[PDB]
Amino acid sequence: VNIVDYSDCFEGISGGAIFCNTKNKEYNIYNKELIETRRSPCSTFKIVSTLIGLEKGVINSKESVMGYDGTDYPNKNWNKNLSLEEAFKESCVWYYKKLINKVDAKSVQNILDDLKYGNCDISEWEGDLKNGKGHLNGFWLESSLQISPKEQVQTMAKIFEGDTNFKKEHINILRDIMAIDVNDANINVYGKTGTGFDEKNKRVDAWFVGMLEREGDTYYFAIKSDDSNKEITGPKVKEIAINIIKKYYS
């Protein structure tokens, strides 16, 4: 466990980072207090909810559809019968809500328990209804389920090192749809952003969680901001994460 200073890449934004290489067990941690604090995963939960849907047969491939019903949404790309790959990349809320609501709560509870997914608290299945957004809510979106960045990395490692019971075919679907382009062919980066606002503490929950492969070595990582500035989003923290990867992990 090495405590590190990535503050220059955070460019004044409050947050922390954790990178873990499980081959040689090198844990690099910036802002240890934050990295151990549990928070809502927000859209980073799509990593796990995709695998749940595949395991239960609700979806089957990166082409799989969820039966769009014509409801009007402000995001153009949500207004179509999109595939799993597109719903993941466009963070289509209705697709992932419909997917998870086809799965019984005990199945979800047991999978989260097996993954040690934070507090594994799905008690508020419906999510944070007081924000007025109705069915565009769920237990993983600023609601009962909370996970620390360190726990995110531990879960990512267990999934992608093949240490869970999820099918390899399903892991590979997730890998494909998580891959991102960082304009450096010499590293393979995979990840997912998340964005929420913590109304109790007046702070954002801005996430980028994923993994990095660079010549035999793999790092699992979670970058997280808790800034009070509402302008700080998941996509912004992904930029920060990319800067760290290029500076220290290339």
Ligand X SMILES: *C(=O)N1C[C@H](NOS(=O)(=O)O)CC[C@H]1C(N)=O
Which residues of this chain interact with ligand X, rule CB under 6 A?
42-43, 91, 93, 141, 193-196, 234-235
CB of 62 vs ligand X, minimal distance in Å: 18
CB of 248 vs ligand X, minimal distance in Å: 23
Which candidate, 92, 78, 79, places its Cα nearest to that of 50?
Answer: 92
Contact 155, 209 (CB under 8 A): no
CA distance 213 to 64: 27
CA distance 109 to 70: 31
248: left (phi over 0), alpha (psi -120 to 50) or beta: alpha
CB of 108 vs ligand X, minimal distance in Å: 18
Which candidate, 185, 183, 187, places its Cα nearest to that of 210?
Answer: 187
Q: Which is nearer to ligand X, 28 or 98 (CB)?
A: 98
Q: Which is nearer to ligand X, 141 or 222 (CB)?
A: 141
CB of 236 vs ligand X, minimal distance in Å: 9
- Return the beta strands (E) in the chain as ranges: 2-3, 15-21, 26-30, 179-180, 188-198, 203-214, 217-225
Q: Which is nearer to ligand X, 29 or 99 (CB)?
A: 99
CB of 168 vs ligand X, minimal distance in Å: 26
Q: Which is nearer to ligand X, 59 or 141 (CB)?
A: 141
At position 78, the amino acid (one-letter code) is W
Q: Which is nearer to ligand X, 9 or 93 (CB)?
A: 93
CA distance 47 to 176: 12
Q: Which is nearer to ligand X, 15 or 194 (CB)?
A: 194
CB of 140 vs ligand X, minimal distance in Å: 9
